[PDB]
Amino acid sequence: RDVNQLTPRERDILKLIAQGLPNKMIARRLDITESTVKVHVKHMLKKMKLKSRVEAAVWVHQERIF
Amino acid sequence: RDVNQLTPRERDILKLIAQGLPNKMIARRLDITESTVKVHVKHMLKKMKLKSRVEAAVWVHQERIF
DNA sequence: CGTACCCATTAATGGGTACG
DNA sequence: CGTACCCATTAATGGGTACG
């Protein structure tokens, strides 16, 4: 699990997920469509080998990433 | 937002959600049906004024509830 | 309280193509 | 890379009734 392997946008989304935001809120916060957020989300999830956004959030708080 | 306001089983579910498990896994870990797991999740979210299981997970880690 | 359904609806997952 | 859509599916939400 290496956070540096993600792209800037992917880290943007991961940070917001770790703050408990649903895809629609992330889209409004970053001012991009929900479609795009979802693309970043699945890319991040595949690269980090995480089963869901909840794992992503928990993982972020455990390894104190960001 | 007091964790003590929850029932024992509700805290069991919260703990497992904060460990990033989906309802189906929680059901197997607790040896109860997914149906019952969903009822506890639903009760817990309303009582704790959380909007999703992700907020529940982040909250637990931020306030170190457990 | 905990159990386990019923209902409907929305959110999220995970594969694809496309194009500056 | 980042954008934004296409597809289909599962996971999750949030009301309800029921019963030991």
How many Cβ atoms from other residues are within 10 Å of residue B18's Cβ?
21
CA separation for the pair B24, B36 (Å, rounded): 10
Domains of chain A, CATH where assigned: 1-66 (1.10.10.10)
CA separation for the pair B63, A21 (Å, rounded): 17
Q: Return left, alpha or beta for B21; rule: phi > 0 is left, psi -120 to 50 is alpha, else beta.
A: beta
Residues of B (20-49) whose Cβ lies below 8 Å from A: 20-22
CA separation for the pair B39, A40 (Å, rounded): 31
CA separation for the pair A6, B59 (Å, rounded): 25
A9: nearest nucleotide, CA–C1' criterion: D2
Please report, rounded to whole angstroms, the spatial distance between the CA atom of protein residue B8 and the C1' atom of nucleotide D2.
Answer: 46
The answer to whether the beta carbons of residues B17 and B41 sit under 8 Å apart is yes
Q: What is the CA radius of gyration of chain A?
A: 11
Q: How far is CA B16 from the centre of its chain?
A: 6
CA separation for the pair A35, B57 (Å, rounded): 25
Experimental technique: X-ray
CA separation for the pair B35, A59 (Å, rounded): 27
Query: What is the residue-wise DSSP string for A7-63?
Result: -HHHHHHHHHHTTT--HHHHHHHHTS-HHHHHHHHHHHHHHTT-SSHHHHHHHHHHT
CA separation for the pair B46, B59 (Å, rounded): 14
